[PDB]
Write a protein that binds this ligand. Structure first.
Ligand SMILES: N[C@@H](Cc1ccc(O)cc1)C(=O)N[C@H](C(=O)O)[C@H]1[C@H](O)[C@](O)(CO)[C@@H](O)CN1O
Ligand SMILES: N[C@@H](Cc1ccc(O)cc1)C(=O)N[C@H](C(=O)O)[C@H]1[C@H](O)[C@](O)(CO)[C@@H](O)CN1O
Lengths: 319, 319
């Protein structure tokens, strides 16, 4: 038993684990409970969010469980990770409006509603309670400043000033992990490179609060185009997984006009084909580039997936 | 948490449980490990085997696990359940040949190969070992004759004589359940009406051997045609889920020419639609019978499933 660890590292989806061996272990023994999340900083996800939520499927595939968290709380604050400009808060309706969009997509990418499947959580439930005096007593006590001033994320901000709220974000997200680690049994936190800091911060506080209850962190990598030009950025800014911002036809194309270099890879990253199917599909590429098979299947795979069987047609029938 | 128990009894898939409440319970608490099996008495399954193995999916759907057992051992003996004529043994090649067929179908109906998914077991592994003196000591001791002479199955046989082997079958199958109950954690045994006796017999010996380690038995019902004529029996004897004995076109038809009375039901029994989709699909039936929607979708559902997306086409394109 250890095939899942096998394809996630063939397909190259492993940027870093906190404790390699430890993760390798429980994955080949117990049925883990890994989760991922996103704040409602928009009313639609974008292909940058496609990789991480798929890796959650990869896991679910072999008996494991995935938990999808929507930032109904940490959303209103926003994650300075990466950013090198302070954010700007947003209207209670704005957030509570956005989550209606993001939730409509997840619900389609994953299967919510079972007796023991994935779960959709919103942190405004546990962060919506906890008070000012409280937060300071119960959590702040064992969350030292030298540590926070250590998070890579923060410096870009420390450099041209980081407001206190951007600064008290990591503690908001640590509280989360812990809550799930103690509430749904969560032990692994999957997320992009931009989440190393927050992930780790979650386990560091899990240890202080009570000798780290078997928690670990996994990071999916950074999808890199071949030419060195921003995966996910069209003139039409991003490439939105929302039909009416980025359509199946526009969607379709994006994957079929995708370069041959960064092609098989993307096949591994976003398709549920096997090493065989790809092997062959890598072949058609390597010697009969005219039929343009790679670029084609990829497309029709991710499109039927994201957008539909029929809309795939509709898209193709417009091609 | 209790939706699965909800649709299995809406769709009517529950003929009987050994301990109703007890099953209701662990199903709304822990992720069960239910299994089902079939002896290689042929090299292809038939629609009579479609219901039970689907109900295993129903379960797997909500976090649970299914184990598919092939009778590589109890096969060579054959289950007198139902039968009212002694069986006839069969060639070691014959069995070892048949299982190649039956396994090719399961592998397509279920997903074998994961870190923690369903598992394919063959009992010739645990029954292939156990010796004559042994079997008598370790198992026979606490397997009283008055009990066996109680199994409904047996009397039909007791009436026109039951050979000892048909008689020592139930103990072969009890040993199984137990082995899985102690080996893979199995707690529920799903199978058709014709398996009540064997199922129960498995838990009765599990208790004697050691206070029944939390085992229960579930039975799917008997698919009944509307007219009262043998579901699954064509002139072409059965309706084989093997392409080259019962083809997608022949397959296709069988479901589209299926009567309107026993139609929505069969929709519930064999399709993964919702109560909604069916509601509507029950409607089209009830007032626009000309479009013949029920009979149609059913077909194309079960066909794409059993035989393929493309072969569905091929079938339709021959319709
Ligand atoms: N603080 C997190 C959100 C979070 C919310 C609650 C938690 O308890 C832990 C983290 C974040 O910044 N997420 C990105 C987002 O937009 O929501 C998102 C990124 O955009 C990403 O590319 C795909 O979602 C990858 O970094 C994974 N991420 O969660
Ligand atoms: N003794 C069982 C097989 C068995 C094998 C190993 C076990 O440890 C327990 C039982 C039997 O008779 N099965 C049917 C078959 O043909 O294999 C089969 C029936 O045909 C059925 O209709 C669908 O498979 C339903 O009764 C479920 N059944 O298992």
């Amino acid at each position: 038993t250890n095939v899942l660890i096998e394809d996630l590292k063939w397909r190259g989806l492993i940027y870093q684990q906190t404790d390699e061996q430890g993760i390798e272990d429980l994955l080949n023994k117990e049925q883990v409970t890994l989760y991922c999340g996103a704040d409602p900083t928009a009313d639609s996800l974008h292909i940058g969010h496609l990789l991480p939520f798929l890796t959650l499927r990869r896991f679910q595939e072999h008996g494991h469980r995935p938990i999808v968290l929507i930032g109904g709380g940490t959303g209103m604050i926003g994650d300075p990770s990466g950013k090198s400009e302070e954010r700007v808060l947003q209207t209670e309706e704005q957030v509570d409006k956005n989550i209606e969009g993001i939730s409509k997509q997840m619900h389609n990418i994953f299967e919510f509603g079972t007796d023991h499947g994935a779960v959709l959580v919103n942190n405004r439930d546990w962060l919506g309670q906890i008070s000012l005096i409280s937060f300071l007593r119960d959590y702040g006590k064992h969350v030292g400043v030298n540590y926070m001033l250590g998070k890579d994320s923060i410096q870009s901000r420390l450099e041209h000033g980081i407001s206190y709220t951007e600064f008290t974000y990591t503690i908001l997200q640590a509280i989360d992990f812990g809550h799930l680690n103690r509430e749904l049994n969560c032990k692994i936190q999957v997320g992009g490179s931009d989440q190393w800091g927050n992930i780790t911060s979650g386990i560091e506080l899990m240890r202080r609060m009570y000798g780290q209850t078997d928690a670990y962190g996994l990071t999916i990598p950074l999808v890199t185009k071949s030419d060195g030009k921003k995966f996910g950025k069209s003139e039409s800014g991003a490439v939105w997984l929302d039909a009416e911002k980025t359509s199946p036809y526009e969607f379709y194309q994006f994957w079929i006009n995708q370069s041959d270099e960064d092609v098989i890879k993307f096949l591994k990253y976003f398709t549920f084909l096997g090493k065989e199917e790809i092997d062959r599909l890598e072949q058609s590429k390597n010697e009969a580039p005219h039929l343009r098979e790679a670029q084609k299947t990829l497309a029709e795979e991710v499109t039927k997936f994201i957008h539909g069987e029929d809309a795939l047609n509709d898209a193709i029938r417009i091609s």
